[PDB]
From a paper:
Glycoside hydrolase family 7 (GH7) CBHs have been identified as the major protein secreted under cellulase-inducing conditions in several different fungi and play a key role in the degradation of plant biomass, both industrially and in nature. They act processively from the reducing end of a cellulose chain. The most significant structural feature of GH7 CBHs is the presence of a 50 Å long cellulose-binding tunnel in which up to 11 subsites for binding of glucose residues from a cellulose chain have been identified. In this study, we report the crystallization, structural determination and biochemical characterization of H. grisea var. thermoidea Cel7A (HgtCel7A).
The C-terminal linker–CBM1 part was proteolytically removed from the full-length HgtCel7A with papain and the isolated catalytic domain was crystallized, yielding crystals belonging to space group P212121 with two protein molecules, chains A and B, in the asymmetric unit. The two noncrystallographically related protein molecules in the asymmetric unit are practically identical along the β-sandwich core of the structure, but deviate at extended loops that enclose the active site, probably owing to different crystal packing. However, two residues at the C-terminus (438–439) were not visible and are not present in the final model of chain A. One loop that folds back onto the globular domain in chain A to enclose the tunnel at subsites −3/−4 (hereafter called loop B2), appears to be open in chain B and is partly disordered. On the other hand, the last two residues of the catalytic domain, Pro438 and Gly439, show clear density and are included in chain B. The N-terminal glutamine residue is cyclized to pyroglutamate (PCA1) in both chains, and all 18 cysteines form disulfide bonds. N-Glycosylation is evident at Asn271 in chain A, with density for one N-acetylglucosamine residue (NAG), but the density is not clear enough to place an NAG at the corresponding position in chain B. In chain B, the loop is open and partially disordered, with insufficient density to build residues 193–200, probably owing to interference by crystal contacts with a neighbouring protein molecule that prevents closure of the loop. Loop B3 adopts a new conformation where Tyr248 points into subsite +2 of the active site, which has not been observed previously in any GH7 structure. The structure of HgtCel7A indicates that the loops that surround and define the cellulose-binding path through the enzyme have higher flexibility and mobility relative to those of HjeCel7A. The long and remarkably mobile loop B2 is anchored by a salt bridge between Glu191 and Arg206 at the N- and C-termini of the loop.
Author numbering: 1 to 437
């Protein structure tokens, strides 16, 4: 896609902390950008749209290549259109934002390093910490903070049809190989584009976009999970149709990425009252979330550890109480055993497991912060029983939300002003980001 400026693009400012041995930190003045899927997409000459509602203008976009060369994404009205606001070290994402002419649902944002590049993070051997307020996001919603192996320039140098780049939030990929992404590989994903059956603003195209994903935080006030997803191709790759994998079909595991990941959700792992509203990690108030990425003796990713801080108390991660699945952290052996115990296909191991994840963690990953609902599964995989059939067994119940929850139309009508606030990002070597740790 090209970039236009009918709307001046001003990345909202956000500071974060880069920490070093002993807990010294320096404040970095930075900013955020909106993902290209949410932007106004129109002809470079016109303001004639290339995409409206959930449909490409096929009288304008006649092929994937020319569509991206002749259409641009434009700047974003962060506050008024998207309900995206910052205040110092804090980023607030509102769920539904109604304007004069239209209503926006959800957002996905990236941390920037200057105007034209994403701030990359090399997680292996390091510790990523942030504060979060999930009190106002409930069943069926996800306020996510996570890492993906996107290109730092959003694909600008790899793909000549992409002139917008990281400045305009291009180049998204994740371990679900999503096919709803409008520009992939500098080409418009117009081929066989199918309007969503339930989302008036989304559709799905011929191609999907895959890459390694480390889900530090997929959460609402009822459930949270941290989940590495390895991919046999580390960085951003395009996949074709059903070979993509990542949906709930027979072809789920056919793509290069593990769409399930090896997940640690304390509720799912047998501690139903560790995390949630009124629980030990109490989602009705601000939480500090610490995630450490430990190397083994060979320098590979050996362990992923989680600690919380709330009201000054350091809370280690809940131990898993699932028989044969001992420990309060993610390791290869833990994952092997968890998959057996839950009866789940071990695609984590098949796609290279902890070691392959560590290959992505050793290199640059991009910080993603988003608020979204789930038109495919209603977020039941996060906070309810999933799949719905499987009710009475280890692994089935991931949170206390009823299986009625998460239908996008319902949550959008009943909780439009839902929001998540991410704040006080600190990143550095293990032991540098938080005192008493
Ligand atoms: C379950 O969480 C509680 C806090 O609610 C904690 O005291 C306990 O150690 C946890 N169980 C396990 C097995 O870690």
């Amino acid at each position: 896609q090209q970039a236009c400026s009918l709307t001046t693009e001003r990345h909202p400012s956000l500071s974060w902390k880069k920490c070093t041995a002993g807990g010294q930190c320096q404040t970095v003045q930075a900013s955020i950008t909106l993902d290209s899927n949410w932007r106004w997409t129109h002809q470079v000459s016109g303001s004639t749209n290339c995409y409206t509602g959930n449909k490409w203008d096929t009288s304008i976009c006649t092929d994937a290549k020319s569509c991206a060369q002749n259409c641009c994404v434009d700047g974003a009205d962060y506050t008024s259109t998207y309900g995206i606001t910052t205040n110092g070290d804090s980023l607030s994402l509102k769920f539904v934002t109604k304007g004069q002419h239209s209503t926006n649902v959800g957002s996905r944002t990236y941390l920037m390093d200057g105007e034209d590049k994403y701030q990359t993070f090399e997680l292996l051997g390091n510790e990523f910490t942030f504060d979060v307020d999930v009190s106002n996001i409930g069943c069926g919603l996800n306020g996510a903070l996570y890492f993906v192996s996107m290109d730092a320039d959003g694909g600008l140098s790899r793909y000549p049809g992409n002139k917008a780049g990281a400045k305009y939030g291009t180049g998204y990929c994740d371990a679900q190989c999503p096919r709803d992404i409008k520009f992939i590989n500098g080409e418009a994903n117009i081929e066989g584009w199918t309007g969503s059956t339930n989302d008036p603003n989304a559709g799905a195209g011929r191609y999907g976009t895959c890459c390694s994903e480390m889900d530090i935080w997929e959460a609402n006030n009822m459930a949270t999970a941290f989940t590495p997803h390895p991919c046999t191709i580390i960085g951003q790759s395009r996949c074709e149709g059903d070979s993509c994998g990542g949906t709930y079909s027979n072809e789920r595991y056919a793509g290069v990425c593990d769409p399930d990941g090896c997940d640690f959700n304390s509720y799912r792992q047998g501690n139903k009252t560790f995390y949630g509203k009124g629980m030990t990690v109490d989602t009705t108030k601000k939480i500090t979330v610490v995630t450490q990425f430990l190397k083994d003796a060979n320098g590979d990713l050996g362990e992923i550890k989680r600690f919380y801080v709330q009201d000054g108390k350091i809370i280690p991660n809940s131990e898993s109480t699932i028989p044969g699945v001992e420990g309060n952290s993610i390791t290869q052996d833990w994952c092997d055993r968890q998959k057996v115990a839950f009866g789940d296909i071990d695609d984590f191991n098949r796609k290279g497991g902890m070691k392959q994840m560590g290959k992505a963690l050793a290199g640059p990953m991009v910080l993603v912060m988003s608020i979204w609902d789930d038109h495919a599964s209603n977020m039941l995989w996060l906070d309810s029983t999933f799949p719905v059939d499987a009710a009475g067994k280890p692994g089935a119940e991931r949170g206390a939300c009823p299986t009625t929850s998460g239908v996008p139309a319902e949550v959008e009508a009943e909780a439009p002003n839902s929001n998540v606030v991410f704040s006080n990002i600190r990143f550095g070597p293990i032991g540098s980001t938080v005192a008493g740790l």
